[PDB]
Every structure is written in structure tokens, then in C-alpha cells.
Design a protein around this motif. Sequence first.
Motif, PDB file in Angstrom:
ATOM      1  N   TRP A  24      34.962  13.012 -95.244  1.00 46.59           N
ATOM      2  CA  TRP A  24      36.312  12.543 -94.677  1.00 46.59           C
ATOM      3  C   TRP A  24      37.181  13.683 -94.841  1.00 46.59           C
ATOM      4  O   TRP A  24      37.649  13.828 -95.889  1.00 46.59           O
ATOM      5  CB  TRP A  24      36.723  11.312 -95.515  1.00 46.59           C
ATOM      6  N   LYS A  25      37.733  14.288 -93.693  1.00 46.92           N
ATOM      7  CA  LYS A  25      38.765  15.368 -93.732  1.00 46.92           C
ATOM      8  C   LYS A  25      39.670  14.686 -93.355  1.00 46.92           C
ATOM      9  O   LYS A  25      40.172  14.252 -92.363  1.00 46.92           O
ATOM     10  CB  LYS A  25      38.181  16.441 -92.572  1.00 46.92           C
ATOM     11  N   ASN A  26      40.811  14.763 -94.286  1.00 48.21           N
ATOM     12  CA  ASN A  26      41.962  14.383 -94.304  1.00 48.21           C
ATOM     13  C   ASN A  26      43.025  15.171 -93.126  1.00 48.21           C
ATOM     14  O   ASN A  26      42.835  16.173 -93.053  1.00 48.21           O
ATOM     15  CB  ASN A  26      42.743  14.162 -95.565  1.00 48.21           C
ATOM     16  N   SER A  27      44.030  14.453 -92.652  1.00 49.19           N
ATOM     17  CA  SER A  27      45.027  15.088 -91.684  1.00 49.19           C
ATOM     18  C   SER A  27      46.014  15.766 -92.817  1.00 49.19           C
ATOM     19  O   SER A  27      45.970  15.745 -94.024  1.00 49.19           O
ATOM     20  CB  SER A  27      45.747  13.878 -91.011  1.00 49.19           C
ATOM     21  N   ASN A  30      48.338  13.576 -94.432  1.00 54.23           N
ATOM     22  CA  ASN A  30      47.646  12.649 -95.269  1.00 54.23           C
ATOM     23  C   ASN A  30      47.686  11.267 -94.403  1.00 54.23           C
ATOM     24  O   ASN A  30      47.541  10.076 -95.310  1.00 54.23           O
ATOM     25  CB  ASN A  30      48.043  12.671 -96.545  1.00 54.23           C
ATOM     26  N   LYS A  31      48.173  10.956 -93.418  1.00 55.82           N
ATOM     27  CA  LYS A  31      48.206   9.976 -92.588  1.00 55.82           C
ATOM     28  C   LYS A  31      47.099   9.344 -91.959  1.00 55.82           C
ATOM     29  O   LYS A  31      46.722   8.111 -91.864  1.00 55.82           O
ATOM     30  CB  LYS A  31      49.341   9.832 -91.483  1.00 55.82           C
ATOM     31  N   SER A  33      42.440  10.186 -91.349  1.00 59.15           N
ATOM     32  CA  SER A  33      41.281  10.904 -92.067  1.00 59.15           C
ATOM     33  C   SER A  33      40.109  10.775 -90.927  1.00 59.15           C
ATOM     34  O   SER A  33      39.956   9.557 -90.095  1.00 59.15           O
ATOM     35  CB  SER A  33      40.852  10.241 -93.356  1.00 59.15           C
ATOM     36  N   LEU A  56      45.245   5.832 -92.356  1.00 57.04           N
ATOM     37  CA  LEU A  56      45.185   5.844 -94.055  1.00 57.04           C
ATOM     38  C   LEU A  56      46.411   4.773 -94.425  1.00 57.04           C
ATOM     39  O   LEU A  56      46.382   4.026 -95.390  1.00 57.04           O
ATOM     40  CB  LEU A  56      45.381   6.847 -94.767  1.00 57.04           C
ATOM     41  N   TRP A  80      41.106  19.304 -88.268  1.00 68.80           N
ATOM     42  CA  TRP A  80      42.484  18.943 -87.718  1.00 68.80           C
ATOM     43  C   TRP A  80      43.280  20.133 -86.788  1.00 68.80           C
ATOM     44  O   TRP A  80      43.033  21.342 -87.408  1.00 68.80           O
ATOM     45  CB  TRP A  80      43.255  18.388 -88.646  1.00 68.80           C
ATOM     46  N   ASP A  83      48.799  16.851 -86.353  1.00 73.51           N
ATOM     47  CA  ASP A  83      48.712  15.403 -86.971  1.00 73.51           C
ATOM     48  C   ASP A  83      48.186  14.536 -85.983  1.00 73.51           C
ATOM     49  O   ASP A  83      48.104  13.490 -86.468  1.00 73.51           O
ATOM     50  CB  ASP A  83      50.155  15.028 -87.695  1.00 73.51           C
TER      51      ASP A  83
END
Length: 161
Positions: A24-27, A30-31, A33, A56, A80, A83
Motif C-alpha cells: 500500500w503506497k500512501n498519498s 496520508n488521506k 492509499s 483512510l 502518486w 492528492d
Amino acid sequence: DNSKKMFLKKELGKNSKPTFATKWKNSSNNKFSACIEGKGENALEEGVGKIYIKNLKEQSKWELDLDQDQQKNTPKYIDWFDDNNLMVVISRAHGTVSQGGILYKVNIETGQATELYNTKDNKKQVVYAVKKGDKIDVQILVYEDDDLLESHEETKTITVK
């Protein structure tokens, strides 16, 4: 806009979770993934993978599926862009030569996609990309001829808006 609805948004149950996906690559904020389900930890397994997205905050889950009549193409690499959008590499779903393809900007909500890097040569495949601000470093795998026995790699920095 110069965009096409390449992906279909399919909502998923709260109980659902990937079982054979990339990490899982987070935005950046961090809102959100994202990951690619169906092709293993490094997306090297054959088949049509699905882009899995997670809100998330809201704890929402959905998938972006390639709208196609035959199971020939797949998301191969994702990262990404901002966002609300991803950088997606679309390669052939089956075969040993299909390591990369065309780089797209894909909206995680609408599934609307615009090209970022298309070499217009099937011997020149975008394998991945790294973004830092207004610049993207694009890796291309170049095959010398149709025998596909000899290749080299390139790094191309593109400017974006």
C-alpha cells in the motif's frame, strides 16, 4: 480535456481486502492509499490486475478496473501524481516481454486518464516513474530489435502542469 474514461470505479465492501497485491503506497497528505491486486507483491504475476484505493479517513474502499472487452492489458506500476491522481503504467497482462508500456495520469475517483508518457514504440516501454514537484523521472526499457534479446534503460525527466 484530452482525457478518456479508461477505468471503472467499483465500490467494495468494508470486509473486503486484497489477497495477492503490491504494498500500500500512501498519498502525500496520508488521506488515501493505493495498490495493485491480482499480480503478487511486485506485480510480476500474469493476469489483469486491479487498482485498489482506500479513503483512510472515511474508511471507504473501491477499485479501479480497466474498461476492456478482452483481458489483454493491466495496471503494471502505480505511484502518486498529486492528492487526487495516480501515475499508472499500463502493460500487456500476459507475456515475458510486457514489463512496461504507457504512463498515464489517472483520477482515483472518476477513472479519467490522460497520457503522461507514450513512446509510440512497442520496443520502448515505460517501466516506472518517480515524481518530485513539477518533474517526473520516467524509466524506459528499450529493446534493440524485434528479437527482444538485447535491451537498455533510459531516464527521461519530463516537466508537468
